[PDB]
Design a binder for this molecule. Sequence first.
Ligand SMILES: CSc1ccccc1C(=O)N1CCC[C@H](C(N)=O)C1
Ligand SMILES: [Zn+2]
Length: 139
Amino acid sequence: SGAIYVGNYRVVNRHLATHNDWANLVWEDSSRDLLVSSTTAQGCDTIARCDCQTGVYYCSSRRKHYPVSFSKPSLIFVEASEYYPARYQSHLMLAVGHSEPGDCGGILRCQHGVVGIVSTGGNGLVGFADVRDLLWLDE
Ligand SMILES: CSc1ccccc1C(=O)N1CCC[C@H](C(N)=O)C1
Ligand SMILES: [Zn+2]
């Protein structure tokens, strides 16, 4: 679990969004596994606006933050799960690292701020849904 809180927006994995997130929907994209809902109070996370490919992510299944190198956002095949059929997920970045399904939502950060959240894994990898192209999160 986990979210990004920037301005009056809450960014979560779409597959973990609540019925209340859908009522307060701003934007969602199944192909990116992202959902943004509106909030009453202002959030304090800063979104990174950069092309960093190294950062640190939070792994709840280890209670540990790990430094990682990660690929640029791409269209990657993701195996079927209880949340989606087998499909390509877009704006996805992969790294070598530990992840379990409950780790989705953990933040990936660089020196500029929040880059994205954990969204995929399997086979000794961890994948992150990029949010750096969502410029409207800032206004
Ligand atoms: C850290 S997610 C994970 C972890 C271990 C094994 C598999 C996964 C994983 O790739 N999944 C499961 C949850 C939904 C994901 C999605 N965004 O389609 C796909
Ligand atoms: Zn950066």
